[PDB]
Amino acid sequence: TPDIKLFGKWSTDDVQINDISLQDYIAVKEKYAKYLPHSAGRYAAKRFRKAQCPIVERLTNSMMMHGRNNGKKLMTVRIVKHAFEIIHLLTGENPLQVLVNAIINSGPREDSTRIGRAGTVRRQAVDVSPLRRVNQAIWLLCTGAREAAFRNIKTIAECLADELINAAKGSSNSYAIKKKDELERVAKSNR
Amino acid sequence: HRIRITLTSRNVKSLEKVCADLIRGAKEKNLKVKGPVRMPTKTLRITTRKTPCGEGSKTWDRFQMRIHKRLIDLHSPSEIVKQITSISIEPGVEVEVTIA
Amino acid sequence: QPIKLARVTKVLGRTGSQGQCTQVRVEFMDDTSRSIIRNVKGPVREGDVLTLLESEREARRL
Amino acid sequence: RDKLNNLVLFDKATYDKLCKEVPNYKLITPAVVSERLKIRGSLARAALQELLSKGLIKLVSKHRAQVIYTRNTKG
Amino acid sequence: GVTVKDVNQQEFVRALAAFLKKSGKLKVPEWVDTVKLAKHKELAPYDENWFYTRAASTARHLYLRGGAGVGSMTKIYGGRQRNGVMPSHFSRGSKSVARRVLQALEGLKMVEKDQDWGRKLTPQGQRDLDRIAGQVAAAKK
Amino acid sequence: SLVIPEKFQHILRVLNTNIDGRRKIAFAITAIKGVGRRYAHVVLRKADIDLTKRAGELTEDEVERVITIMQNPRQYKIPDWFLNRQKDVKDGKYSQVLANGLDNKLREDLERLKKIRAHRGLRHFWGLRVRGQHTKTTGRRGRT
Amino acid sequence: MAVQISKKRKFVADGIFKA
Amino acid sequence: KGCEVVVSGKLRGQRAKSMKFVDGLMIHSGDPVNYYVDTAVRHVLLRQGVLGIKVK
Amino acid sequence: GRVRTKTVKKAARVIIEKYYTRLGNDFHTNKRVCEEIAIIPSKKLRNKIAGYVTHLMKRIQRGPVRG
Amino acid sequence: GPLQSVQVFGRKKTATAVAHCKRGNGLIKVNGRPLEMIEPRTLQYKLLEPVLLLGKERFAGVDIRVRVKGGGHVAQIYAIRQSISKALVAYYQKYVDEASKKEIKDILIQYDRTLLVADPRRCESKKFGGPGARARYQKSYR
RNA sequence: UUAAUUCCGAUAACGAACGAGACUCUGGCAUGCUAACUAGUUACGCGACCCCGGUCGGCGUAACUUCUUAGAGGGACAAGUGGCGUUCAGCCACCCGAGAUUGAGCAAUAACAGGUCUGUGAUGCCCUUAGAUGUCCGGGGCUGCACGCGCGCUACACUGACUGGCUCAGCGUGUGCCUACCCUACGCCGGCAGGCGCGGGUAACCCGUUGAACCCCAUUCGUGAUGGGGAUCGGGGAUUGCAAUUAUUCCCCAUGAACGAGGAAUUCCCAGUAAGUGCGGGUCAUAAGCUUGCGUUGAUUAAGUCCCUGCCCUUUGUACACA
Question: Separation of CA H51 and C1' K260 in angstroms?
Fold first, then answer.
């Protein structure tokens, strides 16, 4: 295929990030569209190299946690493949656009932190950068799948498929959107 | 005729001096010589505690001792290279010669 | 109240108790003129964009 | 607090619910059917293999961890 | 044509264990329905005809890498002995199961008590191995 | 085949044992004190029973024949090594013990060591760990 | 000769002799 | 190029001292210490106890 | 963390003042000049000296070098 | 026709893979097995990367015998996908057009660099006072 | 400005020394060099099989050094392009490139009444010295249990347990001086732990191509303190030793405990790193829940700050200098 590279069986062409803020720090189309998430690495060396790592490889990397699931990227990629089948069936349209939309809608844009006048302290609200939007969106939906699957027959590949469908629509059902709106509430509380 | 000289030493450049000496010898006496076969080096490694007593912060010494080995094969009678092998014996390097 | 888009023009320096903000002057994408200083959480570049929930309140130039 | 008393074997009206509701589910897995009908995953799988073999459900791609089916295409 | 290496080995061993069971005359010992396959394993095998699978497994292991005695069969058929509350350790297979499988294949015209120890695969063995390989590949076609 | 058949036994009672019918047979018959996983699997392999069934799908004739093989160890070629009671110090008969019988065996045995006043019995009576286990920093939940 | 010490044990024995 | 003579132990009574006599250049760290600095640690038998000597 | 020490800098300034006419803009040629003219006891030190020589000389032309 | 043999390797980790490229018809086999049978099967496409991108048109002139040793499963898979790709570039400059190699190299290198350049990372040594390279044992106060 | 009293600048200072850096060992690059029947390759001939070819760790000797080994050199320097910088020191990006900070060893001036007299036939003083505080044998003890602390291991499950099948490593050590005591292929008996036979190896030669675990493919299980957990306990069976009771170690059936992710608090760590996962060395007659090394799979977050905790400076005050 010297033509175009499917993600196992999913089409990369005609998948547009509508949000302009998460256009620069989301790498899925034309050049970063690869068959697999599982690649070498060498993103962690420098600062902003993390931004260009395929967003599906970022999802895979974040999905595995809590000791037992450490250095199991082969198990993690097979869960993401199976989830991508399930989000295609349940929804109908492209699984890549499902993931992209879920990540855009899960990303917070205002959150609190402790600020200067270091005499004492102060909790003032600030804006999160488009890379921090991606980072927190992917983390929150990965812990959404983990916490949902833990002690319930609904298998993890199906749990991710629920959380991705929910967040991609902008549900309020998804753990990721609940937590986001909780952060933006506390931001409003102290601004 | 297949005589084999095994040169073994803790020092490398003293081993290479004796090795490069015996090849010069074999070639200037018109003899078939298999070049020095660099057998893998062995690292005698002993790691001790540093303190004689018990009550110092847990620090370890890591003593190493590298031992090096070349062997050079020769197709010749015994007594010619016997006169060569008797020449240029250093304090460091250790020679063992077998006949067949 | 409308969420507004602004392009970060330059990074100034880092503030907060434990150096966990970026003091940056952010120019509005909608109007060419309006540049206000805001504190930014997360790793921010020069030549990216921010989505402001309010377009008026400004950070202190420390 | 709560306890989940799933069936070990089929009831006649639960078997009716299976063979009639499941061929219209766009996602049929042993996890989904076990949640909806209240059955153990062993029976849930055994029924799914029985229904595929009889020729009603449409298999997608199975695995030792995850076995996924869907409804048969109508048009 | 095709050989043993040109087909998926997951289908090959089940095909060969079935092929040997279609013969169904493999000098199978007495204590098959009471024994545990290794002192690192806990239970008896889930399946009842584990002997014909292991006979075919040993057979293709001698095919690929020959000159293998009972001790290398206990090495290759090893796993974790998870020591309960202490951490897990590598442990060997049951010597009896491996020896009796080779003696079964010795009595049958497949292997041979080889010089330099262990068992070879004899031309009749290799033939039956290579022909079923073609049958499995033509089946997966 | 997969429907709960007529007269499916939800509750079984054998050797004063509550075996649930919903359990798979090899882990169903494993319930009683004396029958573990291994002994349950070898005797259900002995009795010509398909171990793929639930513990309620079988018939009472299949129940008695698996109960007989259970109480008849050597009588159906289960060897000396498998038994949970080998060469009893009073009886000298190599045969498995079950719930109420083993309760009698163990109780009599540790009370026998107590009455001969062998240390094992003395450690049993004074309420400490029997097998030379360090008690300087372990065994506090059972002893307040 | 008959005892036939390894190069490792021989070179350590040579070192201890000097020590 | 340079020397260092240390004599340590019970000097001028019961509590012990360390007298340090250096003249010229002396290096302390790195590999060149192996083949430029020649050392010698010794013990001497005096009536109060052991006097330790370190000559560099 | 690439700050050259007094050793590399002083050696560079002494080499240029004595042998200006040989050293040039190319790093590789004046690596070989410094190799010959200066008995430097290690290879990494020779490369760091030669490196700073073809930085000083690449700025002598621009003008007001002080040291 | 005459000799057209070239042996080229690929290392990613302790593992190594060596590919014997030579003229014939298209046949690429690793320790006997075809590329559809080398495990794990989860990394199917990672082995098909140079085939899928260069097309079978470029491969069908020559056959490659890959042989592997050292490292683990993922390591040896990144070793073989490097070994066949490097072997074909080295072949297509030594025996056919230099523009043909320039074409292959630019296509492979711009998809991913690791097809030609080995990742120079190796397992760092352990030091005392800790269970790994950098992690340290638990210090206790009070 | 730097990792740095590291440099550049300012400059009554100029020029230097130790520590820092350099240095040494190791990590990665060479289709270039010198070399290999104790490393292997590509061909070639025979030999087996499937339908000319395919596979061959089946055999055997002509070319060779890519693969393996260890010697010499080469290689990387902020060198090249662009910005910021008193336009200096240098910093940031980007190209070409195997590397654009690999890890450790070493380590100043001086100090502490820090630890060791249970390492020393290093050693002053005191004590004992024949019913010994010496030296040996015989037994017990250092393992003793209402309790409070510290380092660890297995866990609490489905990303999981179980049973099969498939498929990949790197460091090592190996017959003892007295020393007795080695690593083991292969074969028959046995369910297992072992037992009995004949060999190899003092070693790139034999164990050995070190068929490791995780992982990977397919059955069983179905949210139940459950096929999770494996403490505690009975009985029997093997091995070491002169002897295992107070179970040395190992095996088998049996027994099926608290534990639903852990309050106050708190430890370690930024890339082949954390963590998972197994494998050797030390101890060793018996012998890892320790430590010390080695691969294997391989991330989340950060390129910052003095907020907390420490430490070091400069200014300042002092009636303190055993501070």
Answer: 68
